[PDB]
Each structure stands twice: as C-alpha cells, then as structure tokens.
Amino acid sequence: VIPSVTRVLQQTMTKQQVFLLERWKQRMILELGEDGFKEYTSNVFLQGKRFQEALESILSDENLLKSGYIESVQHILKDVSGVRALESAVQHETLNYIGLLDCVAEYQGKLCVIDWKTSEKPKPFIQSTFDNPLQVVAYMGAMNHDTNYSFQVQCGLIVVAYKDGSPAHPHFMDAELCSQYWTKWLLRLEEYTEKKK
DNA sequence: CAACAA
Ligand SMILES: [Ca+2]
Ligand SMILES: [Ca+2]
C-alpha cells in the first residue's frame, strides 16, 4: 500500500511527542474512563469533520453548541477568495505518498493550501500546531507533483477555529517558510520508509 | 483518508 500524509507523520513522532500524548490520554482515561474517553474522542473527531463539511457549503445556533467554530472563522473568510479546489486527493508521482487536503483558495490575494482545524486550546503560535505545517507542505508538494491538477501553489495556511467563537488564528506560511518545513517533512517521509525496509 | 489530543 502507498502511505498517506497523516499516517507518515503519526508513525514518525519523536519520543517526547508520544510521551506527552499517551500521558495526557491516560489522564483522561483516569478521570473519565475507557467507556467515555473513546466517546470524547468520537465527539472531538466529529466536530472537526462537520466544521470542514460546513465551510465546504460556504465556499461552494445548531443543536450542539459547537456553532462557535464558524463564527470564529468569519473574520478569516472575509479574506478568502478565488476558491479553486476543495477536498482534493493528491498524488505524488516521485516520493510516492497520498493525501486529502481541505481546500485550495486565495487568502489575502495569495493562492495557498488551506487546512481548517478545530481546537479547544488556543494556538497563537505555529509551534502550537505541532505537525500541522508539515501536513500542509506535504499536501502542496503532492498536489504540485501530480498529474491531475492544472496549477501549482507555493504558500500554505493553517487556521485554528475555536468552539467558543473566539477569533480564529490564521497561520499563514509564505514561500520560504514552506520550503523549510518541506525538507523537514522530506525527512519525516524517509524515517517512515526506512522503518519499512 | 481523516477528524484531535500534547
Ligand atoms: Ca483540516
Ligand atoms: Ca499538477
């Protein structure tokens, strides 16, 4: 099988990344239990997919109080224009990996790959988004080294929407910053393939 | 394939 982006990264996390995650996870299993912690991550996953699905109808007061995500992002969508693609599967002919980016559109007049995120903790810094930039630059490198797409994009954009309607954090990445993250991702891709053979 | 968690 051919690897995917989010799979390559979650298998190549540092020892300190796995420690902080599984320690937080067992603290949640402790306070709540195995029965509901799986229910918490089920809810957590579900809002992230709905939020993306809900904007997909926008680019083209709910029952749960997760309605703050889109209100959080309206000051972002006021600068999103010229939408060229949404939810695209991306092939990489050379480095052999696949992905599924959220959308491709112009943000503040600059064409970039946008990746929407939901989070309950604020992420003012791109360092707070962990491996999110590598996920974005992996999507652009794939789509750019692809048979199925007419254009090539250079910049990326992470947006972190919050459930309480707070102003979402746009983390724009210009051409040079994407280039550095890309070689970081280029590494990450190789520790995975070197872990297979 | 992804959602998110740190
Ligand atoms: Ca996303
Ligand atoms: Ca192409």
Numbering used by the authors: 129 to 188, 197 to 333
Paper quotes:
Human MGME1 (HsMGME1) protein is composed of 344 amino acids and belongs to the PD-(D/E)XK nuclease superfamily. However, in contrast to DNA2 (2–5) and many other mitochondrial DNases, MGME1 can cleave various types of DNA substrates with a preference for single-stranded DNAs (ssDNA). Structural analysis and comparison suggest that MGME1 follows a two-cation-assisted catalytic mechanism of substrate cleavage.
Using this H180Q mutant, we successfully solved one HsMGME1 ternary complex structure, H180Q–ssDNA2–Ca2+. One six-coordinated Ca2+ ion was bound at the active site of HsMGME1. The Ca2+ ion coordinates with the O atom of acetic acid (ACT), the side chain OD2 atom of Asp238, the side chain OD1 atom of Asp251, the main chain O atom of Trp252, as well as two water molecules. The residue Gln180 does not coordinate Ca2+; compared with His180 in the HsMGME1–Mn2+ structure, the side chain of Gln180 is rotated clockwise around the CA-CB bond for about 150° in the H180Q-ssDNA2-Ca2+ complex. As indicated by the very low root mean square deviation value (rmsd, 0.7 Å), the overall structure of H180Q–ssDNA2–Ca2+ is very similar to that of the HsMGME1–ssDNA2 complex. Instead of forming an H-bond interaction, the NZ atom of Lys253 in the HsMGME1-ssDNA2 structure almost overlaps with the Ca2+-coordinating water molecule W1 of the H180Q–ssDNA2–Ca2+ complex. Though one Ca2+ ion was bound at the A-binding site, the B-binding site was not occupied by any cations in the H180Q–ssDNA2–Ca2+ complex, which may have weakened the overall DNA coordinating ability of Ca2+ and led to the shifting of the A5 nucleotide.
